DNA sequence: CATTGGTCAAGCG
DNA sequence: GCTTGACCAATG
């Protein structure tokens, strides 16, 4: 009744924090505006990209790079999952 | 186990 | 008002 402004247009959920509504709505629309520059990860929320970026390497620690596509990883097992997904040959 | 999407709201000035 | 990151349950 005016608070519709703070309400999700797809499921009727009411928010007090308008930014929570913006992010929630993307779970309906599929919009993923935050794009990793180091892989094809994309997400609905700025801080998820920040969290994701930590999987590409930390400052003081060592980094494992895919020999084929040059992608960097902080965790070797995550590189091997990448190897099997993207370089099956 | 590492990593994720959806959620929540403390804290900032 | 908004950014931020912790929480939780889920995935592989
Ligand atoms: Mg953050
Ligand atoms: Zn909704
Ligand atoms: Zn990435
Ligand atoms: Zn690669």
PDB file of C-alpha atoms (C1' of nucleotides) and ligand atoms in Angstrom:
ATOM      1  CA  UNK A   1       0.000   0.000   0.000  1.00  0.00           C
ATOM      2  CA  UNK A   2       2.993   2.214  -0.714  1.00  0.00           C
ATOM      3  CA  UNK A   3       5.238  -0.184   1.180  1.00  0.00           C
ATOM      4  CA  UNK A   4       4.992  -2.086  -2.093  1.00  0.00           C
ATOM      5  CA  UNK A   5       8.029   0.068  -2.889  1.00  0.00           C
ATOM      6  CA  UNK A   6       9.967  -2.026  -0.344  1.00  0.00           C
ATOM      7  CA  UNK A   7       8.266  -5.280  -1.472  1.00  0.00           C
ATOM      8  CA  UNK A   8       9.500  -7.889  -3.969  1.00  0.00           C
ATOM      9  CA  UNK A   9       7.370  -7.753  -7.134  1.00  0.00           C
ATOM     10  CA  UNK A  10       7.806 -11.499  -7.730  1.00  0.00           C
ATOM     11  CA  UNK A  11       7.031 -13.090  -4.338  1.00  0.00           C
ATOM     12  CA  UNK A  12       5.701 -10.293  -2.123  1.00  0.00           C
ATOM     13  CA  UNK A  13       8.529 -10.394   0.436  1.00  0.00           C
ATOM     14  CA  UNK A  14       8.817  -7.105   2.367  1.00  0.00           C
ATOM     15  CA  UNK A  15      12.214  -5.530   3.124  1.00  0.00           C
ATOM     16  CA  UNK A  16      13.379  -2.773   5.460  1.00  0.00           C
ATOM     17  CA  UNK A  17      16.756  -2.439   3.727  1.00  0.00           C
ATOM     18  CA  UNK A  18      16.068  -1.486   0.091  1.00  0.00           C
ATOM     19  CA  UNK A  19      19.460  -2.859  -0.961  1.00  0.00           C
ATOM     20  CA  UNK A  20      18.449  -6.277   0.366  1.00  0.00           C
ATOM     21  CA  UNK A  21      15.456  -6.122  -1.989  1.00  0.00           C
ATOM     22  CA  UNK A  22      17.670  -5.243  -4.977  1.00  0.00           C
ATOM     23  CA  UNK A  23      19.865  -8.280  -4.328  1.00  0.00           C
ATOM     24  CA  UNK A  24      16.930 -10.566  -3.461  1.00  0.00           C
ATOM     25  CA  UNK A  25      15.123  -9.683  -6.686  1.00  0.00           C
ATOM     26  CA  UNK A  26      18.082 -10.977  -8.699  1.00  0.00           C
ATOM     27  CA  UNK A  27      17.344 -14.453  -7.364  1.00  0.00           C
ATOM     28  CA  UNK A  28      14.174 -14.211  -9.512  1.00  0.00           C
ATOM     29  CA  UNK A  29      15.507 -12.303 -12.507  1.00  0.00           C
ATOM     30  CA  UNK A  30      18.844 -14.075 -12.944  1.00  0.00           C
ATOM     31  CA  UNK A  31      20.658 -10.724 -13.165  1.00  0.00           C
ATOM     32  CA  UNK A  32      24.345 -11.100 -12.209  1.00  0.00           C
ATOM     33  CA  UNK A  33      26.025  -7.708 -12.649  1.00  0.00           C
ATOM     34  CA  UNK A  34      29.283  -8.371 -10.746  1.00  0.00           C
ATOM     35  CA  UNK A  35      31.733 -10.153 -13.053  1.00  0.00           C
ATOM     36  CA  UNK A  36      35.056 -11.706 -12.130  1.00  0.00           C
ATOM     37  CA  UNK A  37      37.907 -10.582 -14.365  1.00  0.00           C
ATOM     38  CA  UNK A  38      39.904 -13.765 -13.658  1.00  0.00           C
ATOM     39  CA  UNK A  39      37.231 -16.343 -14.643  1.00  0.00           C
ATOM     40  CA  UNK A  40      33.644 -16.421 -15.863  1.00  0.00           C
ATOM     41  CA  UNK A  41      32.144 -16.245 -12.350  1.00  0.00           C
ATOM     42  CA  UNK A  42      29.343 -13.689 -12.085  1.00  0.00           C
ATOM     43  CA  UNK A  43      27.125 -12.933  -9.129  1.00  0.00           C
ATOM     44  CA  UNK A  44      24.231 -10.849  -7.844  1.00  0.00           C
ATOM     45  CA  UNK A  45      26.007  -9.132  -4.921  1.00  0.00           C
ATOM     46  CA  UNK A  46      29.194  -7.051  -4.792  1.00  0.00           C
ATOM     47  CA  UNK A  47      30.568  -8.742  -1.664  1.00  0.00           C
ATOM     48  CA  UNK A  48      30.174 -12.199  -3.234  1.00  0.00           C
ATOM     49  CA  UNK A  49      32.632 -11.134  -5.927  1.00  0.00           C
ATOM     50  CA  UNK A  50      34.964  -9.938  -3.169  1.00  0.00           C
ATOM     51  CA  UNK A  51      34.697 -13.295  -1.411  1.00  0.00           C
ATOM     52  CA  UNK A  52      35.104 -15.161  -4.704  1.00  0.00           C
ATOM     53  CA  UNK A  53      38.222 -13.177  -5.636  1.00  0.00           C
ATOM     54  CA  UNK A  54      40.019 -14.674  -2.643  1.00  0.00           C
ATOM     55  CA  UNK A  55      39.966 -18.052  -4.431  1.00  0.00           C
ATOM     56  CA  UNK A  56      42.287 -16.561  -7.089  1.00  0.00           C
ATOM     57  CA  UNK A  57      45.111 -15.843  -4.669  1.00  0.00           C
ATOM     58  CA  UNK A  58      46.061 -14.120  -1.423  1.00  0.00           C
ATOM     59  CA  UNK A  59      48.799 -11.522  -1.010  1.00  0.00           C
ATOM     60  CA  UNK A  60      51.191 -13.255   1.375  1.00  0.00           C
ATOM     61  CA  UNK A  61      50.518 -16.778   0.084  1.00  0.00           C
ATOM     62  CA  UNK A  62      51.541 -18.767  -2.989  1.00  0.00           C
ATOM     63  CA  UNK A  63      49.383 -19.140  -6.092  1.00  0.00           C
ATOM     64  CA  UNK A  64      48.885 -22.076  -8.475  1.00  0.00           C
ATOM     65  CA  UNK A  65      48.307 -21.149 -12.118  1.00  0.00           C
ATOM     66  CA  UNK A  66      46.645 -23.246 -14.786  1.00  0.00           C
ATOM     67  CA  UNK A  67      49.346 -23.886 -17.399  1.00  0.00           C
ATOM     68  CA  UNK A  68      46.743 -23.813 -20.188  1.00  0.00           C
ATOM     69  CA  UNK A  69      44.574 -20.740 -19.545  1.00  0.00           C
ATOM     70  CA  UNK A  70      46.795 -18.962 -16.953  1.00  0.00           C
ATOM     71  CA  UNK A  71      43.992 -18.782 -14.346  1.00  0.00           C
ATOM     72  CA  UNK A  72      45.397 -18.368 -10.797  1.00  0.00           C
ATOM     73  CA  UNK A  73      44.154 -20.280  -7.756  1.00  0.00           C
ATOM     74  CA  UNK A  74      44.934 -20.118  -4.074  1.00  0.00           C
ATOM     75  CA  UNK A  75      43.957 -23.784  -3.480  1.00  0.00           C
ATOM     76  CA  UNK A  76      45.453 -26.610  -5.525  1.00  0.00           C
ATOM     77  CA  UNK A  77      42.321 -28.760  -5.282  1.00  0.00           C
ATOM     78  CA  UNK A  78      40.337 -25.877  -6.758  1.00  0.00           C
ATOM     79  CA  UNK A  79      42.768 -25.735  -9.688  1.00  0.00           C
ATOM     80  CA  UNK A  80      42.308 -29.465 -10.266  1.00  0.00           C
ATOM     81  CA  UNK A  81      38.524 -29.058 -10.271  1.00  0.00           C
ATOM     82  CA  UNK A  82      39.060 -26.310 -12.851  1.00  0.00           C
ATOM     83  CA  UNK A  83      41.356 -28.589 -14.881  1.00  0.00           C
ATOM     84  CA  UNK A  84      38.713 -31.309 -15.054  1.00  0.00           C
ATOM     85  CA  UNK A  85      35.891 -28.887 -15.885  1.00  0.00           C
ATOM     86  CA  UNK A  86      37.577 -26.727 -18.507  1.00  0.00           C
ATOM     87  CA  UNK A  87      40.413 -28.842 -19.939  1.00  0.00           C
ATOM     88  CA  UNK A  88      38.944 -32.353 -20.137  1.00  0.00           C
ATOM     89  CA  UNK A  89      41.424 -33.182 -22.946  1.00  0.00           C
TER      90      UNK A  89
ATOM     91  C1'  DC B   1      36.863 -30.088   2.647  1.00  0.00           C
ATOM     92  C1'  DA B   2      36.437 -25.519  -0.463  1.00  0.00           C
ATOM     93  C1'  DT B   3      33.084 -22.898  -2.300  1.00  0.00           C
ATOM     94  C1'  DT B   4      28.615 -21.398  -3.201  1.00  0.00           C
ATOM     95  C1'  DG B   5      23.619 -18.562  -3.224  1.00  0.00           C
ATOM     96  C1'  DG B   6      20.439 -16.609  -0.289  1.00  0.00           C
ATOM     97  C1'  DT B   7      19.960 -14.225   3.928  1.00  0.00           C
ATOM     98  C1'  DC B   8      20.542 -10.738   7.546  1.00  0.00           C
ATOM     99  C1'  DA B   9      21.648  -6.489   9.752  1.00  0.00           C
ATOM    100  C1'  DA B  10      25.812  -4.055  12.326  1.00  0.00           C
ATOM    101  C1'  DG B  11      28.072  -0.259  11.587  1.00  0.00           C
ATOM    102  C1'  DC B  12      29.385   3.836   9.453  1.00  0.00           C
ATOM    103  C1'  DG B  13      29.575   9.429  10.475  1.00  0.00           C
TER     104       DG B  13
ATOM    105  C1'  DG C   1      20.934   4.408   3.063  1.00  0.00           C
ATOM    106  C1'  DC C   2      24.206   1.606   1.773  1.00  0.00           C
ATOM    107  C1'  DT C   3      28.245  -1.343   1.909  1.00  0.00           C
ATOM    108  C1'  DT C   4      30.067  -5.053   3.838  1.00  0.00           C
ATOM    109  C1'  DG C   5      30.998  -9.505   5.579  1.00  0.00           C
ATOM    110  C1'  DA C   6      29.254 -13.188   8.729  1.00  0.00           C
ATOM    111  C1'  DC C   7      25.821 -16.918   8.979  1.00  0.00           C
ATOM    112  C1'  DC C   8      23.691 -21.180   7.102  1.00  0.00           C
ATOM    113  C1'  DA C   9      22.626 -24.939   4.364  1.00  0.00           C
ATOM    114  C1'  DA C  10      23.747 -26.812   0.020  1.00  0.00           C
ATOM    115  C1'  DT C  11      26.972 -28.770  -3.682  1.00  0.00           C
ATOM    116  C1'  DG C  12      30.665 -31.555  -5.525  1.00  0.00           C
TER     117       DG C  12
HETATM  118 MG1  LIG D   1      33.037  -7.873   1.463  1.00  0.00          MG
HETATM  119 ZN1  LIG D   2      10.974 -12.263  -4.181  1.00  0.00          ZN
HETATM  120 ZN1  LIG D   3      37.012 -15.652 -10.744  1.00  0.00          ZN
HETATM  121 ZN1  LIG D   4      42.731 -23.452 -17.185  1.00  0.00          ZN
END
